[PDB]
Design an enzyme around this catalytic site. Structure first.
Site, PDB file in Angstrom:
ATOM      1  N   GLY A  65       0.813  -1.220   0.000  1.00  0.00           N
ATOM      2  CA  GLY A  65       0.000   0.000   0.000  1.00  0.00           C
ATOM      3  C   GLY A  65       0.843   1.266   0.000  1.00  0.00           C
ATOM      4  O   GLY A  65       2.069   1.209   0.183  1.00  0.00           O
ATOM      5  N   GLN A  66       0.181   2.407  -0.205  1.00  0.00           N
ATOM      6  CA  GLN A  66       0.847   3.717  -0.218  1.00  0.00           C
ATOM      7  C   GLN A  66       1.766   3.905   0.994  1.00  0.00           C
ATOM      8  O   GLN A  66       2.962   4.132   0.842  1.00  0.00           O
ATOM      9  CB  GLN A  66      -0.193   4.843  -0.262  1.00  0.00           C
ATOM     10  CG  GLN A  66       0.380   6.249  -0.405  1.00  0.00           C
ATOM     11  CD  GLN A  66      -0.701   7.314  -0.396  1.00  0.00           C
ATOM     12  OE1 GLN A  66      -1.496   7.412  -1.330  1.00  0.00           O
ATOM     13  NE2 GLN A  66      -0.741   8.118   0.662  1.00  0.00           N
ATOM     14  N   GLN A 119       5.746   4.223   0.703  1.00  0.00           N
ATOM     15  CA  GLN A 119       6.388   5.507   0.985  1.00  0.00           C
ATOM     16  C   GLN A 119       7.302   5.435   2.218  1.00  0.00           C
ATOM     17  O   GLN A 119       8.366   6.059   2.240  1.00  0.00           O
ATOM     18  CB  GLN A 119       5.336   6.628   1.077  1.00  0.00           C
ATOM     19  CG  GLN A 119       4.620   6.840  -0.258  1.00  0.00           C
ATOM     20  CD  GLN A 119       3.704   8.053  -0.319  1.00  0.00           C
ATOM     21  OE1 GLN A 119       3.378   8.523  -1.411  1.00  0.00           O
ATOM     22  NE2 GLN A 119       3.273   8.557   0.838  1.00  0.00           N
ATOM     23  N   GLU A 162      -2.608  -0.035  -7.128  1.00  0.00           N
ATOM     24  CA  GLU A 162      -2.645   0.980  -8.186  1.00  0.00           C
ATOM     25  C   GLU A 162      -1.234   1.549  -8.423  1.00  0.00           C
ATOM     26  O   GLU A 162      -0.382   1.510  -7.519  1.00  0.00           O
ATOM     27  CB  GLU A 162      -3.659   2.078  -7.853  1.00  0.00           C
ATOM     28  CG  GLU A 162      -3.375   2.876  -6.578  1.00  0.00           C
ATOM     29  CD  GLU A 162      -2.590   4.167  -6.777  1.00  0.00           C
ATOM     30  OE1 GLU A 162      -2.345   4.590  -7.927  1.00  0.00           O
ATOM     31  OE2 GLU A 162      -2.221   4.769  -5.751  1.00  0.00           O
ATOM     32  N   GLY A 206      -3.443  -1.824   2.344  1.00  0.00           N
ATOM     33  CA  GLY A 206      -2.739  -1.936   3.616  1.00  0.00           C
ATOM     34  C   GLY A 206      -3.374  -2.905   4.596  1.00  0.00           C
ATOM     35  O   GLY A 206      -2.663  -3.610   5.306  1.00  0.00           O
ATOM     36  N   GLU A 247     -11.679   3.723   8.219  1.00  0.00           N
ATOM     37  CA  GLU A 247     -10.443   3.108   8.748  1.00  0.00           C
ATOM     38  C   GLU A 247     -10.652   2.210   9.974  1.00  0.00           C
ATOM     39  O   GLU A 247     -10.050   1.142  10.042  1.00  0.00           O
ATOM     40  CB  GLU A 247      -9.353   4.157   9.028  1.00  0.00           C
ATOM     41  CG  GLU A 247      -8.783   4.762   7.756  1.00  0.00           C
ATOM     42  CD  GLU A 247      -7.510   5.580   7.958  1.00  0.00           C
ATOM     43  OE1 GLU A 247      -6.452   5.012   8.274  1.00  0.00           O
ATOM     44  OE2 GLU A 247      -7.540   6.802   7.746  1.00  0.00           O
ATOM     45  N   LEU A 301      17.878  -8.417  17.154  1.00  0.00           N
ATOM     46  CA  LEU A 301      16.450  -8.096  17.334  1.00  0.00           C
ATOM     47  C   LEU A 301      15.606  -9.289  17.814  1.00  0.00           C
ATOM     48  O   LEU A 301      14.645  -9.110  18.548  1.00  0.00           O
ATOM     49  CB  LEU A 301      15.862  -7.512  16.041  1.00  0.00           C
ATOM     50  CG  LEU A 301      14.374  -7.133  16.014  1.00  0.00           C
ATOM     51  CD1 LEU A 301      13.979  -6.198  17.155  1.00  0.00           C
ATOM     52  CD2 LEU A 301      14.052  -6.510  14.663  1.00  0.00           C
ATOM     53  N   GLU A 313      16.604 -11.557  19.891  1.00  0.00           N
ATOM     54  CA  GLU A 313      16.875 -11.707  21.325  1.00  0.00           C
ATOM     55  C   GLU A 313      15.949 -10.809  22.152  1.00  0.00           C
ATOM     56  O   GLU A 313      15.456 -11.228  23.209  1.00  0.00           O
ATOM     57  CB  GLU A 313      18.348 -11.394  21.627  1.00  0.00           C
ATOM     58  CG  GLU A 313      18.887 -12.043  22.891  1.00  0.00           C
ATOM     59  CD  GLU A 313      20.405 -12.086  22.921  1.00  0.00           C
ATOM     60  OE1 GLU A 313      21.011 -12.614  21.961  1.00  0.00           O
ATOM     61  OE2 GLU A 313      20.995 -11.601  23.911  1.00  0.00           O
TER      62      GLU A 313
END
Ligand code: GTP
Ligand code: GTP
Ligand code: PO7
Ligand code: CA
Ligand code: MG
Ligand code: MG
Lengths: 57, 421, 440
Positions: C10-11, C15, C71, C146, C183, C252, C254
Site C-alpha cells: 500500500g501507499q 512511501q 494501483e 494496507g 479506517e 532483534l 533476542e
C-alpha cells in the site's frame, strides 16, 4: 510433535483461507446476480409498457 | 482508475455540461481547437480523466452529448468550445419529448438509447482504466429526466462495477412554471435512489434565491444560474482533475461519503459566490447551499470540503475543527471524523481563494418533501395522467414512485433521530 | 546469511519503504546506482549489511524487498525517482485498480488477482537466500490494500513459509492526516485476521508522529514526507541490530524473546530520542542520561497511550552512536528511583540493552538534527491496549448503525466476519487486562 503442529497450522491456515475465498466468491456472485436480475425485471416491465401503448390503439 | 465518461442528456444537461467543459478546458489550458497552451505540468498530470489524446497532440472531451430535440446540437457546436467535441459523439433524436418522462424513459427515448450506448461502449472500450460515469441532466424535463434515468439503468447492466454519478438538476416553480415538473422529478428519484452511487442535488430554487439575494440580479436568466453550477461542478471535480497528494478515485470518495446505499443525495455549496475563517463560515452557511435546505434542520452524516488557492493549511485545519466544535450537534456522533478536507494549490479563474462544499445531510428531506408536496397536489386528483398512461404506463408505478420517495424521507429521518447510546 | 525480506504493501508501506531504503543506503555508503565502494567482495558476501541487500556481479547492492500496491501512482514514483536503479523492475509490483479504502477489495476482489504473482516475486528473493530469517511487512491499518492485501499476504506467507518469523510495521490511523472515514473497520478486520500470522508488530500512531513533528521539529503542518523521515529513523534503530556488526550489539530476535510473553501479546511500544531541530541542537549535546530519560517522557512515543497508568512486561533500550555501558547503567539507576516504572509480578524488572557503534544518519535536507547518539526503547506495556480501545470504540459507533457496511457486503463479505473480528479484539483487550493482574 513440533512437526505435527507446524504442519497443522499450515494445514488449517490453507483450508481456512480456501473456505473464505470460496464463500466470498459465492456471496459476490449472488450479489451481482440479484442486481442484474432486478435490472432484467425492468426490461420485462418496459416491454409491458410498450405493449400496452400498441394494444390501446 | 482514471478515465471518466461524461454524458449530457437534455437541454439542461447539455448547457450545464457546455459550461462545465468551458471552465475545465480553461483551467487545464486547452483552447477550442484542443491544444495545450498553459505553463504548469499540473494542468496535464491528470488530464486523461476527462480528455482523449488524438493525433497531433489533440485533447478531446470524453463527452457524449444526447437529446431527443435537435437544435440543442447547433447551440453547443456554435458555443465557445463547440469545435473541441468529437463529431460522432453527438447522438440526437428526431421529434423531441416535450416535458414527458414516459416518452423519454419507455417509448421515444428507448428507441434512441441503443445508438447512445454504442458511443458509450466505443468511449469505454478505449479507456485504459474506466472508473465511472457522470450524467448532467434536469429531473423536470422529458429527455434528461426520463431517457437519462433509462441510460443510468442501461449503463448499470453493462458496467455494474463502475461508479454512476449524476449532477441531477431539481425543478422549481420560481425558475420554470411548467406544471407537470413534480411528476417527472418524483419518477426520476425512484430510479436514482436504486441505480446511482452518488447524486448531486443541484437545485433551481436555491440557485434562484442565491442569484436574486446575493448576486443582486432582479430576474435571472439560465446563464446566471449556470455560472453557479459550473463553479460547483468545477469544485467537486477538483479532487480528480488536479494532483495534490490526495490519492482517491470515484469509488474511494463514494465509500467515505455514502454510509447507506440509498442515502447518496448530497447538498452542494460554493464560496465565495477573502480570508480562510470567512470561507469556512460561508460554505457551512445555508445561504451558500446549491440545494434549498437548512443543515440546522437536520444532521450531517458526512461532509467533504475542498479548498482552492494559496492559503495556510494549518489555518484550514484550525478552522474546520472550529466549526465542528461550534456546530457539534449538527454532525451525527455515531460516525467519527466524518468531516474531511482537501486543499488545492490552483485556484479557479477569477477568484484567488475559493471553497466548495459537499454534504450528505438528513436535511435533504426538505428538498424531497417540497417535491413530494408539489407531486401529491396533482396526483391525488389524477391530473395530467393522460400524458403518462397514454404512452403505456400504469397508475401502480406512480404510487411506487411516491412511496419510494416517502421511504427515502423516512430513512433520512430515522438516522437523524438515531443516537449513539 | 540471516537474511531479511522487506515487504511494502500500500501507499503508506511503499512511501515508508522509500524513507527506510534511502536511509539504509546512506547508513551503508550505498550510492543511488547501487554501488558500494567500501565493499571489496564483489558479487556477494557474508557481511552484516547483506541481511538487507543482495549483491550482483556488477557490484549492485539490491534491496531484499518487494513493493506491492493495487494501483500504479505511488510505485511509479519509485520507478522514476532517485533510487530507480536500486530495484529490479520485478520487485516493484502494481495493479490497475485500488482497494478503495475497502478491506474486502484488498483481501478478496481486487487482491486475489495479484496475490499469486506477489508470492512468486517473494519466492525469487527467498531462493536468493542461504539462511532466510523472516519478513518485515510495512503497511497501514486504514487503507484497503494496507489492511486487506496485507492480511491475505500474511495468511499465504504462513502456508508457503511455515512458522518463519513475520514482523509488522503497522501504521495506526489518525484523523489529522487521514481522509478515510472507514479506517476503524479496516483496522479491526486486518488486526483480527493477521493476529495468528504475525510474531511481533510495531505499531506507529500517525497522531503521535504528527505531534512530534509539530512540537520537536517546529513543522507547522507536517506532511507524510515529514512523518516518514521520522518513522524511518525508528525503523532504522530497530533494524540496526540486524544490519550492523558489533561487540555490544544485541540481535532483534533476542529482544523479541523478552518482548513477547504470549503469542497474542506481540505489540511493543516504541519510543525514540532525541527528535530535535538543527537550531535547537546547536551548542546542545544530549548525553546518554538525557536521551534515556526522554524514553520515559510519553510525548516521545510512537503510540499515544500512558505507560504510567499501566504495567511493564519488558523494557529494551536500543542505543546507537557514541554510547558505552557505563553511562547506560548510570542513567538507568537514576530513572529507576525517579520514575513510574511498575512491572508485573511474573516478569523480571531488569532493562535489556544493545549498543550499535555506527552513529545515526540524517537524510540530506531533512528536519532532524544530526546527533552523536540516539536511543529507541521497545517496551511491552499493557498501556498499548488503550490504542486498541480508542479504535474499538470508533468501530462500535459505526457498526451499531451498520454505517458503510454495504460497501463491504457488496464485495462479498458477511456480517459474521465483522462481529467475529470485533470479538477477537474484545478478547485481545481482555488479554492485556489479564496479564496486568497479579498472581495468586
Ligand atoms: N439550472 C438550469 N436549469 C435549466 C437549464 N435549462 C433548463 N433548465 C431547467 O430544466 C427543467 C426542464 O428540463 P429540460 O432540460 O428543459 O427538458 P429536457 O430534459 O431537455 O426534456 P425535453 O424538453 O422534453 O426535451 C426546467 O425546470 C428548467 O428550469 C439551465 O441551463 N440551467
Ligand atoms: N505514516 C504514513 N501514513 C500514511 C502514508 N500514506 C498514507 N498513510 C495513512 O494510511 C491510511 C490510508 O491508507 P493507505 O495506505 O493510503 O491506502 P492503501 O494501503 O494504498 O489502500 P487503498 O488506497 O485503499 O487501496 C491513512 O491513515 C493515511 O493517513 C505515509 O506515507 N506515511
Ligand atoms: C474532501 C475529500 C477528502 C477529497 C473527499 N472525501 C470524500 N469525498 C471527498 C470529496 C469529493 N467526493 C465525491 O464523491 C465527489 C464526487 C465527484 C467527483 C468527481 F471528480 C467527479 C464526479 C463526482 F460526482 N467529489 C469530491 O470532491
Ligand atoms: Ca560483499
Ligand atoms: Mg430538449
Ligand atoms: Mg492506496
Amino acid at each position: 510433535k513440533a512437526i505435527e503442529e507446524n504442519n497443522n497450522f499450515i494445514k488449517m491456515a490453507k483450508e481456512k483461507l480456501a473456505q473464505k475465498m470460496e464463500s466470498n466468491k459465492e456471496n459476490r456472485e449472488a450479489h451481482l446476480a440479484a442486481m442484474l436480475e432486478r435490472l432484467q425485471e425492468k426490461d420485462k416491465h418496459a416491454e409491458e409498457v410498450r405493449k400496452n401503448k400498441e394494444l390501446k390503439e | 482508475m482514471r478515465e471518466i465518461v461524461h454524458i449530457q442528456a437534455g437541454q439542461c444537461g447539455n448547457q450545464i455540461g457546455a459550461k462545465f467543459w468551458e471552465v475545465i478546458s480553461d483551467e487545464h489550458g486547452i483552447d477550442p481547437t484542443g491544444s495545450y497552451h498553459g505553463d504548469s505540468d499540473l494542468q496535464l498530470e491528470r488530464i486523461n480523466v476527462y480528455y482523449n489524446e488524438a493525433t497531433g497532440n489533440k485533447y478531446v472531451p470524453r463527452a457524449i452529448l444526447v437529446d431527443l430535440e435537435p437544435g440543442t446540437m447547433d447551440s453547443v457546436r456554435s458555443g465557445p468550445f463547440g469545435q473541441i467535441f468529437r463529431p460522432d459523439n453527438f447522438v440526437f433524436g428526431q421529434s423531441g419529448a416535450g416535458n414527458n418522462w414516459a416518452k423519454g424513459h419507455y417509448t421515444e427515448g428507448a428507441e434512441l438509447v441503443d445508438s447512445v450506448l454504442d458511443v458509450v461502449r466505443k468511449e469505454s472500450e478505449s479507456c485504459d482504466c474506466l472508473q465511472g460515469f457522470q450524467l448532467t441532466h434536469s429531473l423536470g424535463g422529458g429527455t434528461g429526466s426520463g431517457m437519462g434515468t433509462l441510460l443510468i439503468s442501461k449503463i448499470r447492466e453493462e458496467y455494474p462495477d463502475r461508479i454512476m454519478n449524476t449532477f441531477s438538476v431539481m425543478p422549481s416553480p420560481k425558475v420554470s412554471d411548467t406544471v407537470v415538473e413534480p411528476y417527472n422529478a418524483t419518477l426520476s428519484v425512484h430510479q436514482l435512489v436504486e441505480n446511482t452511487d452518488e447524486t448531486y442535488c443541484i437545485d433551481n430554487e436555491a440557485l434562484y434565491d442565491i442569484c436574486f439575494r446575493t448576486l443582486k440580479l432582479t430576474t435571472p436568466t439560465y446563464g446566471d444560474l449556470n455560472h453557479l453550477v459550473s463553479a460547483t461542478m468545477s469544485g467537486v471535480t477538483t479532487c480528480l482533475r488536479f494532483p495534490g497528494q490526495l490519492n482517491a478515485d470515484l469509488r474511494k470518495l463514494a465509500v467515505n461519503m455514502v454510509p447507506f446505499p440509498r442515502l447518496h443525495f448530497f447538498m452542494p455549496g460554493f464560496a465565495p459566490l477573502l480570508t480562510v475563517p470567512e470561507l469556512t463560515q460561508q460554505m457551512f452557511d445555508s445561504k451558500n447551499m446549491m440545494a434549498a435546505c437548512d443543515p440546522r434542520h437536520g444532521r450531517y452524516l458526512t461532509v467533504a470540503a475542498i479548498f482552492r488557492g494559496r492559503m495556510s493549511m494549518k489555518e484550514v485545519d484550525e478552522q474546520m475543527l472550529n466549526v465542528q466544535n461550534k456546530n457539534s450537534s449538527y454532525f451525527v456522533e455515531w460516525i467519527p471524523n466524518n468531516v474531511k478536507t482537501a486543499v488545492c494549490d490552483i485556484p479557479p479563474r477569477g477568484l484567488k481563494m475559493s471553497a466548495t462544499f459537499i454534504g450528505n445531510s438528513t436535511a435533504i428531506q426538505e428538498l424531497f418533501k417540497r417535491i413530494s408536496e408539489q407531486f401529491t397536489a396533482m396526483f391525488r386528483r389524477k391530473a395530467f395522467l393522460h400524458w403518462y398512461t397514454g404512452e403505456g404506463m400504469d397508475e401502480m408505478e406512480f404510487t411506487e414512485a411516491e412511496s419510494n420517495m416517502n421511504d427515502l424521507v423516512s430513512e433520512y429521518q430515522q438516522y437523524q433521530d438515531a443516537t449513539a447510546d | 546469511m540471516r537474511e531479511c525480506i522487506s515487504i511494502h504493501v500500500g501507499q503508506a508501506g511503499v512511501q515508508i519503504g522509500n524513507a527506510c531504503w534511502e536511509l539504509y543506503c546512506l547508513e551503508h555508503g550505498i550510492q543511488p546506482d547501487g554501488q558500494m565502494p567500501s565493499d571489496k567482495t564483489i558479487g556477494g558476501g557474508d557481511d552484516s549489511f547483506n541481511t538487507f541487500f543482495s549483491e550482483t556481479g556488477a557490484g549492485k547492492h539490491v534491496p531484499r524487498a518487494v513493493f506491492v500496491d493495487l494501483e500504479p501512482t505511488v510505485i511509479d514514483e519509485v520507478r522514476t525517482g532517485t533510487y530507480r536503479q536500486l530495484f529490479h523492475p520485478e520487485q516493484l509490483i502494481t495493479g490497475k485498480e485500488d482497494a478503495a479504502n475497502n478491506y474486502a477489495r484488498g483481501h478478496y476482489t481486487i487482491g486475489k488477482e495479484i496475490i499469486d504473482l506477489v508470492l512468486d516475486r517473494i519466492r525469487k528473493l527467498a531462493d536468493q537466500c542461504t539462511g532466510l530469517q523472516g519478513f518485515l511487512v510495512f503497511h497501514s491499518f486504514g487503507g484497503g490494500t494496507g489492511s486487506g492485501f496485507t492480511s491475505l499476504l500474511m495468511e499465504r506467507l504462513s502456508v508457503d513459509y511455515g512458522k518463519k518469523s513475520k514482523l509488522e510495521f503497522s501504521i495506526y490511523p489518525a484523523p489529522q492526516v487521514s481522509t478515510a472515514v472507514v479506517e476503524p473497520y479496516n483496522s479491526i478486520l486486518t488486526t483480527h485476521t493477521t493476529l495468528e500470522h504475525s510474531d511481533c508488530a510495531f505499531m506507529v500512531d500517525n497522531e503521535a508522529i504528527y505531534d512530534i513533528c509539530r512540537r520537536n521539529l517546529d513543522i507547522e503542518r507536517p506532511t507524510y514526507t515529514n512523518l516518514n523521515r521520522l518513522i524511518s529513523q525508528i525503523v532504522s534503530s530497530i533494524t540496526a541490530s540486524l544490519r550492523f556488526d558489533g561487540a555490544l550489539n544485541v540481535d532483534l530476535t533476542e529482544f523479541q524473546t523478552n518482548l513477547v510473553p504470549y503469542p497474542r501479546i506481540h505489540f511493543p511500544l516504541a519510543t525514540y530520542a532525541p527528535v530535535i531541530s538543527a537550531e535547537k541542537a546547536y551548542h546542545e549535546q544530549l548525553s546518554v542520561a538525557e536521551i534515556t530519560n526522554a524514553c520515559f517522557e510519553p510525548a516521545n512515543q510512537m503510540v499515544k497511550c500512558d505507560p504510567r497508568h499501566g504495567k511493564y512486561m519488558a523494557c529494551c533500550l536500543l542505543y546507537r552512536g557514541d554510547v558505552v555501558p557505563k553511562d547506560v547503567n548510570a542513567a538507568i539507576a537514576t530513572i529507576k528511583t525517579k520514575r513510574s516504572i511498575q512491572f508485573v509480578d511474573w516478569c523480571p524488572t531488569g532493562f535489556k540493552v544493545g549498543i550499535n557503534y555506527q552513529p545515526p544518519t540524517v537524510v540530506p535536507g531533512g528536519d532532524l538534527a544530526k546527533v552523536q547518539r540516539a536511543v529507541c526503547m521497545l517496551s511491552n506495556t499493557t498501556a498499548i491496549a488503550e490504542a486498541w480501545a480508542r479504535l474499538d470504540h470508533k468501530f462500535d459507533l459505526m457498526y451499531a448503525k451498520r454505517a458503510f457496511v454495504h460497501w463491504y457486503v457488496g464485495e462479498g463479505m458477511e456480517e459474521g466476519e465483522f462481529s467475529e473480528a470485533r470479538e477477537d479484539m474484545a478478547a485481545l483487550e481482555k488479554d492485556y487486562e489479564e496479564v496486568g493482574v497479579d498472581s495468586v
